[PDB]
């Protein structure tokens, strides 16, 4: 009997309780039963994305076979999962693997269709050793073999509909991703399962927050899997936070330190201090052991409750009479009421410790999965975020308007008020040249991560051709650069919560703008390989300078909103209308005035002070020299860079000249006082 | 569609409602061992047997 040798009896594990309570899914199990009883096409295959519970739905079909919710023709069947492993684990000779496999097939023909075979990973099944699945082919659509498929979405498109020789057998069962509330209904039968293994309690606000935040933020994986991942991993978090403590570490390090100090002193007083801290340590240790014993009793009695539920379902299959009312009305409510007495007892005694899983734990576990601050407001990041305008004005001095709009955008994404169909803010920074566009984007990158060069800064002026879409997005399959993929659709799929700078966007060839339409419409972007990257946690900022003539001409003596409309019409001459219809806010700058340039001069002098302090030369300045910089580094046509490189020239050339001369020794303070026209560096 | 009608013929709903009701009242009557539930259970068992024989 090879059936006892190389098969997994899922009816055995179903009756033994080694499977899991499948919730909902009546429609898809029913349609599977439909396809199992046809004349031709007697082989349902399941088509779902990887991780939507296909094996779970097959085992739920198995439990409905055991529980007798099926029609009479399926009452008494056998569900056998074919062991791939033990067949290969002894194979040495010519086809002895397939000898075992053919013996199993002859035993299935011997069982005469009373055994419903189930072999998942069907795309792997077709070649696994005439090889592994086309031995089977005549027996499928004749009432002999009824193998039930269950396989992935794309691999169905690989190895099944292309291989059309077996295609008149199998049938599509699109196992859809269940919704949010359906997954909530799933976990409320699996909350009870995970509390037997992690010895902690799970709270229903944490379950509903886990379902909603998992469905919104982790976009790689899918329901119902990712919510289970968040619940399990937060259970591990709380199990570790219980399993430490902290005050025991503090007291232990302190008592061994004072132990070494008193053993050195052998005035003392440290015998008394040591005895006090040892008594405190013994008290906290005894409280810790008492809390551990409390949780141990609570978890053992909860496992007793769960085994009572398992045994009463065993009795429901069996049908004893006094055992039913006995187990139910004796065991269940008394164990529930003393379990809740233990619950309020742990509400009394757990001080040292979080016995339960809150939704802030799901927030922390999710915030370590991606990086999005779903974390609640602590003191540091909240006070850092409320002073957004002061931070960005202490790098980007000038330009109130874009700082206001960007600050409001990031606040509206932290508070949750942003639409989860679009990205956080799609911006189109117009304006003249050299006015802090790229430095506003570096200011956001240095606020959000504390780093200037932590932003996907894709220059767009490398994208002046039609193969540029192949550069940024990816390379279509079977070509040279298939292995790497794009530079945008890969550098976001690793790191969701990031900033994507597209600098000088109008220089690019407009099929790239077709790609950007796909981004700002969906948020998911299609590459050459095929899978998509959710851009609804990013901040797409596009710079340009398209209205430079018009803004430098007419931003004086004109208002703000009509200027925005006028240059937006200029943009409509440049871009597509459907494109800039899909923008959050098109903030339009203004050229920099005198006070702004004095402040920019002070910023650049501060970074120069930092450079020459790492060099080891302390520098003071007279404000007249600052006026010389203001009167040489000012003109409206170029913006801010004449100031920067006028600073560079008139300060750094005589200064670095003399520093290489050896004239200026470190230690003294270089007073940059004025010459008649130049700026002298003096030593006194 | 043939499979759907094969299921609806081979597998009913009111029998499930009646079977859950009689096993629940059997639980309650086994617990109470006032009654009235011997009579109610006998009525529902007679109705269940009638529907079963008709089926
Ligand atoms: N209806 C359900 N009721 C209870 N648990 C479920 C349900 N659907 C899915 N699950 C859980 O989700 C898990 C998914 O298991 P699998 O079916 O193996 O996943 P999958 O979708 O089959 O992906 P693969 O190909 O098997 S790795 C199950 O093991 C259960 O823990
Ligand atoms: N308000 C400001 N605060 C600090 N630096 C500024 C400010 N405005 C302009 N700058 C300087 O302007 C220089 C030019 O940087 P960019 O941002 O590239 O210029 P932009 O004016 O924003 O437009 P483009 O197209 O990028 S040249 C930077 O080196 C900054 O030092």
Tab-separated table of C-alpha atoms in Angstrom, chain A residues 55-377:
chain	number	residue	atom	x	y	z
A	55	UNK	CA	-4.078	25.510	0.616
A	56	UNK	CA	-6.361	26.896	3.322
A	57	UNK	CA	-9.372	26.727	1.014
A	58	UNK	CA	-8.497	23.162	0.053
A	59	UNK	CA	-8.270	22.198	3.716
A	60	UNK	CA	-11.560	23.988	4.366
A	61	UNK	CA	-13.072	21.848	1.643
A	62	UNK	CA	-11.543	18.886	3.485
A	63	UNK	CA	-13.143	19.913	6.783
A	64	UNK	CA	-16.510	20.331	5.088
A	65	UNK	CA	-16.031	16.796	3.778
A	66	UNK	CA	-15.375	15.658	7.353
A	67	UNK	CA	-18.218	17.723	8.801
A	68	UNK	CA	-20.655	16.545	6.135
A	69	UNK	CA	-21.711	19.877	4.627
A	70	UNK	CA	-21.196	18.438	1.127
A	71	UNK	CA	-23.571	16.515	-1.166
A	72	UNK	CA	-23.847	12.775	-0.691
A	73	UNK	CA	-21.520	11.901	-3.576
A	74	UNK	CA	-18.628	13.458	-1.673
A	75	UNK	CA	-19.547	11.936	1.690
A	76	UNK	CA	-16.819	9.406	2.411
A	77	UNK	CA	-14.079	10.652	0.086
A	78	UNK	CA	-10.377	10.799	0.893
A	79	UNK	CA	-8.218	13.909	0.527
A	80	UNK	CA	-4.599	13.008	-0.179
A	81	UNK	CA	-1.822	15.548	-0.640
A	82	UNK	CA	0.991	14.033	-2.645
A	83	UNK	CA	4.293	13.992	-0.746
A	84	UNK	CA	6.955	15.297	-3.098
A	85	UNK	CA	9.689	14.852	-0.527
A	86	UNK	CA	9.832	11.230	0.560
A	87	UNK	CA	9.718	10.036	-3.048
A	88	UNK	CA	12.957	11.848	-3.910
A	89	UNK	CA	14.661	11.025	-0.599
A	90	UNK	CA	15.572	7.458	-1.595
A	91	UNK	CA	15.768	7.516	-5.384
A	92	UNK	CA	18.903	6.184	-7.072
A	93	UNK	CA	18.038	4.229	-10.206
A	94	UNK	CA	16.379	4.484	-13.611
A	95	UNK	CA	12.806	5.626	-13.112
A	96	UNK	CA	12.431	4.078	-9.662
A	97	UNK	CA	11.100	7.486	-8.680
A	98	UNK	CA	8.545	7.204	-11.485
A	99	UNK	CA	8.098	3.543	-10.554
A	100	UNK	CA	6.875	4.698	-7.143
A	101	UNK	CA	4.795	7.439	-8.759
A	102	UNK	CA	3.173	5.030	-11.210
A	103	UNK	CA	2.452	2.622	-8.360
A	104	UNK	CA	0.665	5.444	-6.554
A	105	UNK	CA	-1.284	6.193	-9.745
A	106	UNK	CA	-2.294	2.543	-10.045
A	107	UNK	CA	-3.417	2.620	-6.423
A	108	UNK	CA	-5.504	5.699	-7.227
A	109	UNK	CA	-7.064	3.862	-10.154
A	110	UNK	CA	-7.632	1.020	-7.686
A	111	UNK	CA	-9.469	3.411	-5.356
A	112	UNK	CA	-11.942	4.039	-8.220
A	113	UNK	CA	-12.527	7.769	-7.805
A	114	UNK	CA	-13.426	7.594	-4.114
A	115	UNK	CA	-10.228	9.567	-3.391
A	116	UNK	CA	-10.058	13.257	-4.278
A	117	UNK	CA	-6.408	13.934	-5.030
A	118	UNK	CA	-4.938	17.362	-4.293
A	119	UNK	CA	-1.523	18.414	-5.557
A	120	UNK	CA	-0.607	22.044	-5.037
A	121	UNK	CA	2.194	23.813	-6.914
A	122	UNK	CA	0.728	22.580	-10.158
A	123	UNK	CA	3.193	24.454	-12.365
A	124	UNK	CA	5.945	22.621	-10.520
A	125	UNK	CA	3.932	19.402	-10.784
A	126	UNK	CA	3.970	19.265	-14.605
A	127	UNK	CA	7.701	18.646	-14.522
A	128	UNK	CA	8.908	17.000	-11.299
A	129	UNK	CA	10.857	13.873	-12.308
A	130	UNK	CA	5.682	11.202	-19.014
A	131	UNK	CA	7.729	13.171	-16.479
A	132	UNK	CA	5.313	13.826	-13.617
A	133	UNK	CA	1.892	14.990	-14.811
A	134	UNK	CA	1.452	13.815	-18.361
A	135	UNK	CA	1.757	10.265	-17.217
A	136	UNK	CA	-1.636	11.167	-15.798
A	137	UNK	CA	-3.324	12.716	-18.822
A	138	UNK	CA	-5.880	10.091	-20.043
A	139	UNK	CA	-7.018	9.306	-16.502
A	140	UNK	CA	-8.048	12.925	-15.820
A	141	UNK	CA	-11.140	13.513	-18.002
A	142	UNK	CA	-12.552	9.993	-17.723
A	143	UNK	CA	-13.766	9.730	-14.126
A	144	UNK	CA	-10.578	8.000	-12.989
A	145	UNK	CA	-8.260	10.764	-11.779
A	146	UNK	CA	-9.592	13.910	-10.148
A	147	UNK	CA	-6.456	15.828	-9.190
A	148	UNK	CA	-7.282	19.229	-7.699
A	149	UNK	CA	-4.957	22.013	-8.731
A	150	UNK	CA	-3.899	25.032	-6.726
A	151	UNK	CA	-1.263	27.318	-8.151
A	152	UNK	CA	-0.069	30.863	-8.614
A	153	UNK	CA	-1.536	33.506	-10.956
A	154	UNK	CA	1.482	34.108	-13.179
A	155	UNK	CA	2.599	30.474	-13.218
A	156	UNK	CA	-0.851	29.562	-14.464
A	157	UNK	CA	-0.047	31.867	-17.352
A	158	UNK	CA	3.376	30.240	-17.678
A	159	UNK	CA	2.924	26.514	-17.613
A	160	UNK	CA	-0.777	25.869	-18.127
A	161	UNK	CA	-2.520	27.931	-20.805
A	162	UNK	CA	0.590	27.890	-22.987
A	163	UNK	CA	0.822	24.096	-22.606
A	164	UNK	CA	-2.527	23.627	-24.292
A	165	UNK	CA	-2.295	19.809	-24.484
A	166	UNK	CA	-3.849	19.462	-21.025
A	167	UNK	CA	-5.887	22.670	-21.243
A	168	UNK	CA	-9.252	21.013	-21.909
A	169	UNK	CA	-9.012	19.617	-18.342
A	170	UNK	CA	-8.524	22.397	-15.814
A	171	UNK	CA	-10.782	25.312	-14.878
A	172	UNK	CA	-10.043	28.810	-13.635
A	173	UNK	CA	-11.100	29.539	-10.058
A	174	UNK	CA	-10.101	33.130	-9.394
A	175	UNK	CA	-9.558	33.084	-5.635
A	176	UNK	CA	-9.857	36.817	-5.078
A	177	UNK	CA	-8.220	38.787	-2.321
A	178	UNK	CA	-10.851	39.055	0.422
A	179	UNK	CA	-11.746	42.487	1.690
A	180	UNK	CA	-10.818	44.208	4.939
A	181	UNK	CA	-13.778	43.158	7.084
A	182	UNK	CA	-13.611	39.620	5.732
A	183	UNK	CA	-10.021	39.389	6.939
A	184	UNK	CA	-11.199	40.775	10.278
A	185	UNK	CA	-13.625	37.858	10.309
A	186	UNK	CA	-10.713	35.543	9.483
A	187	UNK	CA	-8.536	36.699	12.367
A	188	UNK	CA	-11.273	36.419	14.981
A	189	UNK	CA	-11.022	32.659	14.588
A	190	UNK	CA	-7.242	32.924	14.458
A	191	UNK	CA	-6.800	35.284	17.398
A	192	UNK	CA	-7.591	32.260	19.528
A	193	UNK	CA	-4.990	30.164	17.735
A	194	UNK	CA	-2.094	32.589	18.189
A	195	UNK	CA	-2.798	33.013	21.879
A	196	UNK	CA	-1.870	29.376	22.512
A	197	UNK	CA	1.582	29.792	21.034
A	198	UNK	CA	2.867	33.192	22.124
A	199	UNK	CA	1.277	33.021	25.610
A	200	UNK	CA	-0.044	36.592	25.277
A	201	UNK	CA	-3.471	38.108	24.723
A	202	UNK	CA	-4.607	39.833	21.534
A	203	UNK	CA	-7.046	42.742	21.567
A	204	UNK	CA	-9.734	43.458	18.970
A	205	UNK	CA	-8.687	47.108	18.285
A	206	UNK	CA	-5.285	45.676	17.411
A	207	UNK	CA	-6.934	43.257	14.983
A	208	UNK	CA	-8.987	45.897	13.190
A	209	UNK	CA	-5.992	48.248	13.059
A	210	UNK	CA	-3.842	45.395	11.755
A	211	UNK	CA	-6.256	44.578	8.959
A	212	UNK	CA	-6.730	48.200	7.885
A	213	UNK	CA	-3.100	49.316	8.119
A	214	UNK	CA	-1.812	46.126	6.490
A	215	UNK	CA	-4.238	46.533	3.590
A	216	UNK	CA	-3.217	50.144	3.172
A	217	UNK	CA	0.555	50.172	3.602
A	218	UNK	CA	2.270	46.850	2.872
A	219	UNK	CA	1.603	46.784	-0.858
A	220	UNK	CA	3.988	44.005	-1.853
A	221	UNK	CA	2.196	41.217	-0.002
A	222	UNK	CA	-1.570	40.739	0.236
A	223	UNK	CA	-4.442	39.864	2.515
A	224	UNK	CA	-5.087	37.642	4.506
A	225	UNK	CA	-1.416	36.915	4.897
A	226	UNK	CA	0.060	40.284	5.846
A	227	UNK	CA	-2.382	40.897	8.687
A	228	UNK	CA	-1.408	37.505	10.094
A	229	UNK	CA	2.215	38.580	9.765
A	230	UNK	CA	1.622	41.787	11.714
A	231	UNK	CA	-0.301	39.974	14.460
A	232	UNK	CA	2.277	37.197	14.818
A	233	UNK	CA	5.261	39.529	14.759
A	234	UNK	CA	3.755	41.921	17.289
A	235	UNK	CA	3.011	38.912	19.476
A	236	UNK	CA	6.717	38.142	19.317
A	237	UNK	CA	7.471	41.768	20.202
A	238	UNK	CA	5.330	41.625	23.320
A	239	UNK	CA	6.644	38.176	24.253
A	240	UNK	CA	10.165	39.598	24.188
A	241	UNK	CA	9.171	42.728	26.104
A	242	UNK	CA	7.735	40.522	28.828
A	243	UNK	CA	10.709	38.189	28.819
A	244	UNK	CA	13.384	40.676	29.956
A	245	UNK	CA	12.903	43.159	32.458
A	246	UNK	CA	14.763	46.469	32.742
A	247	UNK	CA	14.858	47.435	36.424
A	248	UNK	CA	16.394	44.040	37.167
A	249	UNK	CA	19.206	44.948	34.751
A	250	UNK	CA	19.675	48.342	36.425
A	251	UNK	CA	19.673	46.848	39.920
A	252	UNK	CA	21.931	43.939	38.906
A	253	UNK	CA	24.572	46.162	37.305
A	254	UNK	CA	24.390	48.518	40.286
A	255	UNK	CA	24.727	45.773	42.897
A	256	UNK	CA	27.646	44.103	41.140
A	257	UNK	CA	29.301	47.526	40.800
A	258	UNK	CA	28.812	48.292	44.492
A	259	UNK	CA	29.867	44.711	45.285
A	260	UNK	CA	33.187	45.286	43.519
A	261	UNK	CA	33.501	48.688	45.218
A	262	UNK	CA	32.903	47.274	48.713
A	263	UNK	CA	35.234	44.342	48.030
A	264	UNK	CA	37.818	46.957	47.025
A	265	UNK	CA	37.226	48.990	50.199
A	266	UNK	CA	37.957	45.955	52.395
A	267	UNK	CA	33.919	54.358	56.339
A	268	UNK	CA	32.007	51.703	54.477
A	269	UNK	CA	28.210	52.496	54.348
A	270	UNK	CA	28.089	50.292	51.263
A	271	UNK	CA	27.216	47.182	53.203
A	272	UNK	CA	24.047	49.091	54.122
A	273	UNK	CA	23.490	50.430	50.591
A	274	UNK	CA	24.198	46.961	49.164
A	275	UNK	CA	21.798	45.263	51.585
A	276	UNK	CA	19.069	47.785	50.726
A	277	UNK	CA	19.556	47.263	46.996
A	278	UNK	CA	19.743	43.472	47.441
A	279	UNK	CA	16.442	43.547	49.326
A	280	UNK	CA	14.991	45.666	46.510
A	281	UNK	CA	16.384	43.182	43.974
A	282	UNK	CA	14.855	40.243	45.849
A	283	UNK	CA	11.491	42.039	46.012
A	284	UNK	CA	11.479	42.794	42.289
A	285	UNK	CA	12.635	39.241	41.521
A	286	UNK	CA	9.829	37.758	43.613
A	287	UNK	CA	7.283	40.056	41.960
A	288	UNK	CA	8.676	39.020	38.569
A	289	UNK	CA	8.356	35.321	39.425
A	290	UNK	CA	4.820	35.916	40.709
A	291	UNK	CA	3.831	37.626	37.458
A	292	UNK	CA	5.410	34.815	35.428
A	293	UNK	CA	3.487	32.244	37.483
A	294	UNK	CA	0.270	34.228	36.978
A	295	UNK	CA	0.726	34.307	33.204
A	296	UNK	CA	1.680	30.620	33.246
A	297	UNK	CA	-1.537	29.673	35.035
A	298	UNK	CA	-3.590	31.905	32.740
A	299	UNK	CA	-2.075	30.388	29.614
A	300	UNK	CA	-2.380	26.792	30.836
A	301	UNK	CA	-6.034	27.317	31.718
A	302	UNK	CA	-6.667	28.991	28.349
A	303	UNK	CA	-5.097	25.981	26.635
A	304	UNK	CA	-7.462	23.856	28.723
A	305	UNK	CA	-10.347	25.923	27.323
A	306	UNK	CA	-9.121	25.456	23.755
A	307	UNK	CA	-8.696	21.703	24.215
A	308	UNK	CA	-12.213	21.638	25.651
A	309	UNK	CA	-13.455	23.271	22.433
A	310	UNK	CA	-11.497	20.752	20.342
A	311	UNK	CA	-12.879	17.822	22.339
A	312	UNK	CA	-16.440	19.104	22.070
A	313	UNK	CA	-16.078	19.382	18.303
A	314	UNK	CA	-14.795	15.800	18.421
A	315	UNK	CA	-17.974	14.914	20.312
A	316	UNK	CA	-20.066	16.777	17.726
A	317	UNK	CA	-18.538	14.551	15.056
A	318	UNK	CA	-18.984	11.483	17.279
A	319	UNK	CA	-22.348	12.160	18.922
A	320	UNK	CA	-22.190	11.336	22.614
A	321	UNK	CA	-25.059	12.769	24.617
A	322	UNK	CA	-24.188	13.487	28.245
A	323	UNK	CA	-20.626	14.299	27.159
A	324	UNK	CA	-21.946	17.208	25.076
A	325	UNK	CA	-23.916	19.004	27.806
A	326	UNK	CA	-21.270	17.953	30.353
A	327	UNK	CA	-18.296	19.433	28.461
A	328	UNK	CA	-20.220	22.524	27.337
A	329	UNK	CA	-22.120	23.692	30.388
A	330	UNK	CA	-19.546	22.460	32.849
A	331	UNK	CA	-16.212	23.290	31.300
A	332	UNK	CA	-16.724	26.322	29.048
A	333	UNK	CA	-18.367	29.010	31.267
A	334	UNK	CA	-16.430	28.183	34.451
A	335	UNK	CA	-13.106	28.281	32.603
A	336	UNK	CA	-14.205	31.500	30.909
A	337	UNK	CA	-15.123	33.165	34.202
A	338	UNK	CA	-11.953	32.101	36.004
A	339	UNK	CA	-9.970	33.032	32.889
A	340	UNK	CA	-11.461	36.509	33.145
A	341	UNK	CA	-10.775	36.503	36.877
A	342	UNK	CA	-7.176	35.838	35.851
A	343	UNK	CA	-7.524	38.646	33.289
A	344	UNK	CA	-8.554	41.203	35.902
A	345	UNK	CA	-5.947	39.716	38.259
A	346	UNK	CA	-3.285	40.470	35.649
A	347	UNK	CA	-4.905	43.875	35.250
A	348	UNK	CA	-4.142	44.266	38.952
A	349	UNK	CA	-0.659	42.772	39.168
A	350	UNK	CA	1.157	43.518	35.893
A	351	UNK	CA	3.163	46.648	36.637
A	352	UNK	CA	6.865	45.858	36.089
A	353	UNK	CA	4.682	44.913	31.843
A	354	UNK	CA	2.320	44.841	28.872
A	355	UNK	CA	0.518	41.511	28.946
A	356	UNK	CA	-1.483	42.322	25.816
A	357	UNK	CA	-1.111	43.475	22.224
A	358	UNK	CA	-2.328	46.985	21.479
A	359	UNK	CA	-2.653	48.747	18.144
A	360	UNK	CA	0.420	50.848	18.901
A	361	UNK	CA	2.328	47.569	18.667
A	362	UNK	CA	0.948	47.016	15.186
A	363	UNK	CA	1.982	50.597	14.430
A	364	UNK	CA	5.561	49.959	15.574
A	365	UNK	CA	5.831	46.612	13.770
A	366	UNK	CA	4.536	48.172	10.579
A	367	UNK	CA	6.857	51.153	10.997
A	368	UNK	CA	9.786	48.754	11.037
A	369	UNK	CA	8.499	46.996	7.965
A	370	UNK	CA	8.574	50.063	5.702
A	371	UNK	CA	9.645	53.261	7.414
A	372	UNK	CA	6.339	55.148	7.206
A	373	UNK	CA	5.675	56.836	10.551
A	374	UNK	CA	2.482	55.049	11.426
A	375	UNK	CA	4.090	55.343	14.858
A	376	UNK	CA	2.160	57.493	17.261
A	377	UNK	CA	3.354	60.939	18.246
